[PDB]
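yo

u said u wanted the structure for the complex thing, so here. seqs first:
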Amino acid sequence: KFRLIPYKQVDKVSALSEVPMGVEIVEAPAVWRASAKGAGQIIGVIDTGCQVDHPDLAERIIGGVNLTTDYGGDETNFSDNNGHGTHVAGTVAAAETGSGVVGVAPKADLFIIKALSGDGSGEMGWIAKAIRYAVDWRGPKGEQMRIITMSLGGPTDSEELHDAVKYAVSNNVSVVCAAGNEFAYPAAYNEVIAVGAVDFDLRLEIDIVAPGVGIKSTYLDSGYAELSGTAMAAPHVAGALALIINLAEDAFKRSLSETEIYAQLVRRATPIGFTAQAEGNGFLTLDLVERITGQFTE
Amino acid sequence: KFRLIPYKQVDKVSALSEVPMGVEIVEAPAVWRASAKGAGQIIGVIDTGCQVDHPDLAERIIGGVNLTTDYGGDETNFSDNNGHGTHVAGTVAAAETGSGVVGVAPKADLFIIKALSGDGSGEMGWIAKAIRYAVDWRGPKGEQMRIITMSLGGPTDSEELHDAVKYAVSNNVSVVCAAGNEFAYPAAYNEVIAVGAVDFDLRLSEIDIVAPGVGIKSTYLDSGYAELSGTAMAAPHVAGALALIINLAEDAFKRSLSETEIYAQLVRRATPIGFTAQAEGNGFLTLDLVERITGQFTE
Ligand code: NA
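structre next:
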């Protein structure tokens, strides 16, 4: 079956007051004015649920679903039973309460999808439904999700998963996945944005790399944990794309295809100097575009 | 009709011997080693023909087709009765013969598609076919085009032409296209790569990228050269660059790359100049930008 990619649980803390370095190393501040801290965008978080009422999240969350047999499965109850969904949702979109933590898109909303049970597992139908479900949800304003993220890997290349992948990518949904540690799909899907990881010193088939070592975020019981692993990189990109859609679309005065946004993600990627099989397009440096604008060698 | 995006003739010559500033201002040569100068990539030129026996091009051409009524039309006579097509061919892949002129990818091969007549006009039909021929054409060794370049337009939104554009892209073929100076289609199709123009001063006079379009010299009728200015002269620099991009990037990635990822591989080698997103899309083609940004983190 399909699982949560494995990771070290470096620390559980009760109360933090910082911008997790992951966030600011990727240069999310620099770009928050232009992207409205991501306001307007809805990241669909496909994981283990969430602490709906967690103090950093609750106001960034607009609904969700539960495709897992857990608790019921009562469709209307996706409140986390693991702490991943939480940690992840927090990296993508923790708000500026003047407290705790704040993620890459402290303004993008979240739609919580729980296709993963408390042990971490999921059946593949649950995850293919997770993605399809991402695509089709429209809120009260008919508002829509354009970004989807998972930190899961399956060995079983099924058609059904792929039909959904292409279905999501076919309608302007960016689908973001952490690149496995066996743990291959959906990440080995060429249409998916596959994220691998580096630490803060920028040491380590993928598209980009983002931070994954010693990253703090939300955890269960209004808690906080610090996680090291390959699954922690992806959520930084999901967040990032939220700020990329706002800032791109504003610039081109026009809506953009996800192929055009994939473009836009990868140009906010600086290479580190490992070859491209090792680092894809590079490290996510959000502000790259401004730094290089006026620049030519004579 | 669909037609050549109008443009200026400046000079005709018989003798030139230079690397055109377009070629190196775009930084082809600084990425030739890594790219093998496009070796093994084929660009299909959908235009007015080409002069297959031209000294700078002969060795770059592999085949072509004529889908026009000119010359019979004997499908096997994709020669050029305008001059524009020979010019385009030139900027894409003119060869290094140590004289005359040299293109952006001097080791890419060129498959020539006449879909335009002497006066630069062709029929809405001829281009939709041109695009499917370029997609479906395989070689003696089953080799193919990953690149299509046209620098024509037409006022009509037909599903036939939009289907062909869709068909290329979904089969990993990059549609490169001069955007407009009435000439709205293909360039206005979201899935195409629209190329505006800037001059050598990186000035200008719905786009993805921009390249040089002012006073660009290239091959031209009768084994000669000519200097042309206009939006349509930008495009071939992009078409020839993607040859180099596919090569270097697939080789640094160790993996085949789809057109989508090839498109991104192109945008990320565009330097904004300071103009608006609408005036310059992602910016001017600077092929070497990645190596230049490679180590560069802030603090
Ligand atoms: Na907060």
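The longest strand of chain B covers residues 8-13. The two ends of chain B are 56 Å apart (CA to CA).
cya
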